Design a protein around this ligand. Structure first.
Ligand SMILES: [Zn+2]
Lengths: 52, 73, 329
């Protein structure tokens, strides 16, 4: 499974980036459904973080 | 005939792989120096300067032609 | 100058035909002047496609969510593939013409069917760099003739067990799946592509502008419900971005008015242009304020456009700029 590090965006298969040691994540974005369940919940916290 | 043969190996997927400096054609007949005919070209790939060729073995038992020069008549 | 990097990375020289051409500040709508509504009309999304749906399916979702009439993507990404999927919108929908034939970069995972020493893996993969022979798949074309394609570079990233992760830059029409299959034959043991992600498509890459469908919808909602334009505005790139990798010709205001009114690009209408343009090349026709006017096919080389006094420099294939920007014939 392809992964990448949030900082320095290096691509790797390892859980931890070989370059910065920071943890990596699956490079693919989360699955999407037009129904978008939880979209309301997601926006609630997102509005907060962004300050809307 | 047209040389540029010498099988590198018998790929596990069932093809005789040969390296060459010339690009042959698909379905071309491939034979040994004894004109016994080994199989037919089924694919050509790699760099245009030095391509690989996948010969579809049509013999009862390939793998013997590895390291053996192959030709196209 | 080398097939070692993506062509979009190669900078071109700017030849000057007319040094005193000026532009009217009252005419045109440079990106930083477009109201959000207009920005969308002439926009392109740098979408991070999720694995699962077909690219067409993805475009359909976007047309629905944003209540659009037209949209199109710039390079089919197979269902299981994720990554850069530029999606042009409304009036900019046809800028994809400039993207489909652009260079692409991928990060792929190859799964070998046998145990092979690393050095041999690297060695054999370096052999597939440059012009290579690759016959089209069973799905495409009714003439499966073998042709050549350019692999600008192959860089092995990591090797775990029989899994080989690598980055690859290629010209349009190059199938990563075939490339890996061929590598498998070259190595004898065989291999197949287990995972694939696109990291660059023409001028679009993985940077701050790359956005997911989740971000898209949410930013949209912020604009529609909360009246916040900043986020949705940034989720959409101006069509000009979709043409960054193309050789350009910057034309005088009168030429812009002529082209947006059906004429082709006249040689004397050119103020400055990129070098290296060859007859037949796709070129972006730009305003002196860097607005995209149209896409066209070059009727002559840069050198001819530079020295000629008359005739048609570029055959216009699609006009994006509305007639009211730069009025009169
Ligand atoms: Zn890192």
């Amino acid at each position: 499974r392809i992964r990448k590090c949030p900082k320095c965006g290096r691509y790797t298969l390892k859980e931890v980036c070989p370059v910065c040691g920071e943890k990596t994540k699956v490079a693919h974005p989360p699955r999407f459904s037009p129904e978008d369940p939880y979209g309301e919940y997601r926006r609630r916290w997102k509005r907060e973080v962004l300050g809307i | 005939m047209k040389r540029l043969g010498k099988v590198l190996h018998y790929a596990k997927q069932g093809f005789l792989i040969v390296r060459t400096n010339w690009v042959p054609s698909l379905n071309d007949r491939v034979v040994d120096k004894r004109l016994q005919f080994v199989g037919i070209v089924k694919d050509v790939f790699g760099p245009v300067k030095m391509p690989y060729v996948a010969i579809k073995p049509k013999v009862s038992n390939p793998e013997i032609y590895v390291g053996e020069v192959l030709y196209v008549d | 100058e080398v097939r070692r990097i993506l062509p979009a990375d190669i900078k071109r020289e700017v030849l000057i035909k007319d040094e005193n051409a000026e532009t009217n500040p009252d005419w045109g709508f440079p990106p930083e002047k477009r109201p959000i509504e207009m920005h969308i009309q002439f926009g392109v999304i740098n979408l991070d496609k999720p694995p699962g749906p077909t690219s067409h399916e993805v475009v359909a979702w976007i047309k629905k969510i944003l209540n659009l009439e037209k949209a199109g993507h710039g390079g089919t990404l197979d269902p299981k593939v994720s990554g850069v999927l530029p999606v042009a919108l409304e009036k900019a929908t046809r800028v994809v013409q400039a993207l489909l034939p652009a260079g692409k970069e991928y990060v792929a995972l190859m799964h070998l069917h046998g145990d092979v020493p690393e050095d041999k893996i690297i060695q054999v993969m370096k052999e597939f760099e440059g012009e290579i022979i690759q016959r089209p798949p069973l799905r495409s074309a009714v003439k499966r003739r073998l042709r050549t394609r350019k692999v600008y570079y192959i860089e092995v990233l990591e090797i775990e067990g029989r899994d080989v992760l690598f980055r690859v830059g290629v010209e349009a029409g190059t199938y990563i799946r075939s490339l890996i299959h061929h590598i498998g034959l070259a190595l004898g043991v065989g291999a197949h592509m287990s995972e694939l992600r696109r990291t660059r498509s023409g001028p679009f890459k993985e940077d701050e502008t790359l956005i997911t469908l989740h971000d898209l919808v949410d930013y949209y909602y912020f604009w529609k419900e909360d009246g916040i334009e900043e986020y949705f505005r940034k989720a959409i790139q101006p069509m000009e971005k979709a043409v960054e990798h193309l050789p350009k010709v910057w034309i005088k205001d009168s030429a812009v008015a002529a082209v947006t009114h059906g004429a082709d690009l006249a040689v004397p209408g050119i103020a400055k242009l990129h070098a290296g343009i060859k007859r037949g090349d796709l070129v972006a026709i730009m305003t002196l304020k860097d607005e995209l006017v149209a896409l066209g096919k070059a009727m002559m080389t840069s050198q001819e456009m530079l020295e000629k006094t008359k005739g048609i420099a570029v055959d216009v294939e699609k006009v994006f700029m509305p007639r009211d920007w730069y009025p009169k014939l």
